[PDB]
């Protein structure tokens, strides 16, 4: 009546068509298989925390965080430097303010520590 066509530039030079969608899925699965073949008994990814999303819109939702904290790791009963060797992602810049999020993470860490089998250095 509206329409805006951004074809005033030399658009025909930069046209990326993703024919390799099927090729790149295979490529990532081969990558995962290789990583799991090198990291044999371990999962494939670090233990990630539970986290509340920002903004009025999404604060209903609970999502994965980057890492726990020095606080959540200490309350679980271990050190940050040792947590990384057991494959627990640690976030130094994140803060602890909500009690429900805190306790959920501590129990996630505690249940993780019961389920694991750490190998000795010998």
């Amino acid at each position: 009546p509206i329409l805006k066509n951004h074809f005033r530039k030399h658009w025909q030079e930069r046209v990326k068509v993703h024919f390799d969608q099927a090729g790149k899925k295979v490529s990532r699965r081969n990558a995962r298989a290789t990583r799991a073949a090198k990291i044999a008994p371990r999962p494939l990814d670090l233990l990630r925390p539970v986290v509340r999303a920002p903004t009025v819109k999404y604060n209903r939702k609970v999502r994965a965080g980057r890492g726990f904290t020095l606080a959540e790791v200490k309350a679980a009963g271990l050190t940050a430097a040792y947590a990384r060797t057991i494959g627990i992602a640690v976030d130094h810049r994140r803060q602890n303010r909500n009690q429900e999020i805190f306790d959920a993470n501590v129990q996630r860490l505690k249940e993780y520590q019961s389920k694991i089998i750490v190998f000795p250095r010998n």
Binding site: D45, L46, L47, R48, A64, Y112
Partner: peptide, 8 residues
Amino acid sequence: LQTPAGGK
């Protein structure tokens, strides 16, 4: 350790 996208 994270719940996967997709269907198992």
